[PDB]
Write a protein that holds these residues in place. Structure first.
Motif, PDB file in Angstrom:
ATOM      1  N   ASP A 271       0.854  -1.178   0.000  1.00 46.03           N
ATOM      2  CA  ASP A 271       0.000   0.000   0.000  1.00 46.03           C
ATOM      3  C   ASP A 271       0.893   1.232   0.000  1.00 46.03           C
ATOM      4  O   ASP A 271       2.028   1.186   0.479  1.00 46.03           O
ATOM      5  CB  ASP A 271      -0.938   0.024   1.211  1.00 46.03           C
ATOM      6  N   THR A 272       0.374   2.331  -0.545  1.00 42.60           N
ATOM      7  CA  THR A 272       1.082   3.602  -0.567  1.00 42.60           C
ATOM      8  C   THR A 272       0.191   4.700  -0.006  1.00 42.60           C
ATOM      9  O   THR A 272      -1.036   4.592  -0.017  1.00 42.60           O
ATOM     10  CB  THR A 272       1.532   4.001  -1.988  1.00 42.60           C
ATOM     11  N   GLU A 273       0.827   5.757   0.493  1.00 39.43           N
ATOM     12  CA  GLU A 273       0.146   6.981   0.889  1.00 39.43           C
ATOM     13  C   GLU A 273       0.637   8.113   0.001  1.00 39.43           C
ATOM     14  O   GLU A 273       1.846   8.283  -0.182  1.00 39.43           O
ATOM     15  CB  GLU A 273       0.393   7.313   2.364  1.00 39.43           C
TER      16      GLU A 273
ATOM     17  N   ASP B  93      -1.910  -0.896   6.714  1.00 38.84           N
ATOM     18  CA  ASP B  93      -2.876  -1.162   5.654  1.00 38.84           C
ATOM     19  C   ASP B  93      -2.409  -2.294   4.751  1.00 38.84           C
ATOM     20  O   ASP B  93      -3.220  -3.110   4.298  1.00 38.84           O
ATOM     21  CB  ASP B  93      -3.120   0.101   4.834  1.00 38.84           C
TER      22      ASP B  93
HETATM   23 MG   LIG Z   1      -3.142   3.381   3.136  1.00 35.90          MG
END
Ligand SMILES: [Mg+2]
Lengths: 118, 225, 254
Positions: free
Chosen positions: C31-33, C221
């Motif tokens: 996952d990335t933000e 996440d």
């Molecule tokens: Mg996330």
């Protein structure tokens, strides 16, 4: 009263709300590197550009400051788009929506769905 | 020994016309038990001494379509490269320095040109360049030409084309070396040629300060000797 | 320490551990933000799935990634002893960079230290160089799990290629299948799963998964995505996922 910026290739047009919009000025990237400022109809009789600024990017950033009523030493989200276009970071046709203060238009619900992946 | 003379016969008459026929000839002649011997023979006896017939054997590997044989060949290539790197780097061993160039050219063709990486646990290219710099001037003669032959195949890879972050990681280290006043002209000219092969500009590269961090060149993992 | 927070100081030390984990634990949940969405494309589009790529292209090319989380599991859904998740915190200046304020406000609440990112963050160009030769990308046998990962893989491709996204969606997927030959989008697989709807947190309450770590952060996440995939694969897909039907499909894109 919101604002809008359209980057259609070699041209960056700054428009104000009127959801119709009326252009204020356009910053055209000419052949080699030259930027040309072309004020709209009622722009030369409205905004006065001091003679201290000479480059087309300095008068573009001065008109955005006059548009958004930002402080003398500031870089709004409208300036960041201008600085990215002049350096050629915007390479695709995109529109940017801004508030009256020059920041990107606030979308609380879209940001909620992005982090939550809804 | 009769089978041994038939593996040499297959690779002796290889060409683009009979490549498909000779791939089948190998399959009905060499069994699974003798496959590790063929990979050793191909790399040591053909790849190491024949730089012109490298696309011939690379196409042979593609036509053969044996993933297990491809891993044996890659493992044998790394084994033979490390034998030369961890050896006696005499100034008269002209032949041993040519074997490393041929093996480096072969390595890039079967990894970089095939959109495959050169794994860090298998061969760490960037620290090889930094370790050879601090070890001496004879270790640079082995490594810089060897690295330049590996990166020649990056231009033929949509993944490892020069805009690759890893390719400019290596090319910026060679830009630092080109700026050294002690690097010999024969090694400076090799870096310039590599830039022209990759359609790069040596002046437009971004050399860092990697060669001045002496506290980082002291704890380098040693791949040379 | 299930989740390791990686900064510029320990990036190289934590890459040594990752390079050995991927050999045994070949499933990568990620996952990335990112700072949100600020741009919309001009023109008319022949499909809704083409507007989604151009909208994706317009924003990835301008904004930069903030966080990336990587969780490693094996075919049985088991984790490495000790640390299984790595949170990579990249360089980000809240004064010189472009962002959406509603995203920065929503990320500050989660616990993202934006001052540490500016001073002690990772450079994405140095991270991509380290990740290229680690065996996590461009290698056979590695399966990537994700959840609504149109933007997540666009930022990964942006830093892995060190250039802008392809102008055509066809070429974006062509270079995507090279770095990531196998991709499982859990949100795309949920369309064939009965009664599974919602976001990551919403769907990881029908499956009854308990989260580890702070919410809306890449490490926790990504860990939740890994437990979501292996639990959903156990009830709905009978411990087998068809590669000809679900591999490579991203949600929204296509
Ligand atoms: Mg996330």
């Amino acid at each position: 009263m919101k604002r809008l910026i359209i980057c259609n290739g070699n041209k960056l047009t700054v428009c104000t709300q009127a959801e119709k919009y009326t252009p204020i000025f356009s910053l055209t990237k000419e052949s080699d590197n030259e930027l040309t400022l072309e004020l709209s109809g009622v722009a030369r009789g409205y905004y006065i550009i001091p003679s201290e600024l000479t480059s087309s990017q300095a008068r573009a950033a001065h008109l955005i400051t006059l548009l958004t009523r930002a402080e003398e030493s500031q870089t709004t989200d409208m300036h960041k788009i201008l600085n990215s276009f002049v350096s050629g970071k915007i390479t695709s046709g995109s529109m940017f929506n801004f508030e009256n203060d020059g920041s990107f238009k606030r979308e609380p619900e879209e940001a909620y769905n992005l982090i939550n992946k809804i | 020994e009769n089978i041994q003379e038939k593996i040499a016969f297959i690779f002796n008459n290889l060409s683009q016309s009979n490549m498909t026929q000779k791939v089948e000839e190998l399959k009905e002649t060499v069994k699974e038990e003798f496959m590790p011997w063929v990979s050793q023979y191909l790399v040591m006896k053909r790849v190491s001494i024949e730089p012109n017939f490298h696309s011939l054997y690379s196409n042979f590997l593609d036509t053969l379509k044996n993933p297990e044989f491809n891993k044996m060949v890659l493992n044998e290539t790394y084994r033979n490269i490390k034998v030369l790197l961890t050896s006696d780097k005499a100034a008269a061993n002209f032949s041993d320095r040519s074997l490393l160039k041929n093996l480096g050219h072969w390595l890039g063709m079967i990894t970089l040109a095939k959109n495959k990486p050169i794994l860090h646990t298998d061969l760490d290219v960037k620290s090889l360049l930094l370790e050879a710099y601090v070890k001496g001037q004879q270790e640079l003669l082995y490594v810089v030409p060897f690295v330049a032959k590996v990166l020649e195949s990056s231009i033929r890879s949509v993944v490892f084309r020069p805009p690759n972050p890893w390719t400019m990681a290596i090319m910026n280290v060679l830009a630092e070396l080109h700026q050294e006043h002690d690097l010999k002209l024969n090694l400076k000219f090799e870096i310039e040629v590599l830039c022209k092969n990759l359609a790069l500009d040596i002046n437009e590269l971004k050399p860092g300060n990697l060669l001045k961090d002496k506290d980082r060149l002291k704890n380098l993992d040693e791949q040379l000797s | 320490q299930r989740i390791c927070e990686v900064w510029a100081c320990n990036l190289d030390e934590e890459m040594k551990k990752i390079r050995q984990v991927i050999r045994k634990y070949n499933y990568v949940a990620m996952d990335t933000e990112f700072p949100g969405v600020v741009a919309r494309p001009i023109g008319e589009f022949r499909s809704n799935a083409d507007y989604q790529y151009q909208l994706l292209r317009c924003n990835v090319d301008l904004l930069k990634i903030i966080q990336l989380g990587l969780t490693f599991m094996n075919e049985q859904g088991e984790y490495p002893p000790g640390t299984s998740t790595w949170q990579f915190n990249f360089k980000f200046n809240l004064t010189e960079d472009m962002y959406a304020q509603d995203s920065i406000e929503l990320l500050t609440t989660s616990g993202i230290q934006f001052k540490k990112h500016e001073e002690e963050g990772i450079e994405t160009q140095y991270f991509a160089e380290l990740l290229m030769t680690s065996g996590v990308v461009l290698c056979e046998g590695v399966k990537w799990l994700s959840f609504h990962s149109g933007y997540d893989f666009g930022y990964l491709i942006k830093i892995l290629t060190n250039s802008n996204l392809p102008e055509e969606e066809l070429d974006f997927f062509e270079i995507l299948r090279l770095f990531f030959p196998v991709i499982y989008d859990v949100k795309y697989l949920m369309k064939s799963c009965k009664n599974l709807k919602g976001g990551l947190q919403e769907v990881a309450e029908q499956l009854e998964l308990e989260r580890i770590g702070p919410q809306h952060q890449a490490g926790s996440d990504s860990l939740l995505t890994g437990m979501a995939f292996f639990k959903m694969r156990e009830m709905f897909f009978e411990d087998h996922i068809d590669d000809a039907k679900y591999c490579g499909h991203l949600y929204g894109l296509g």
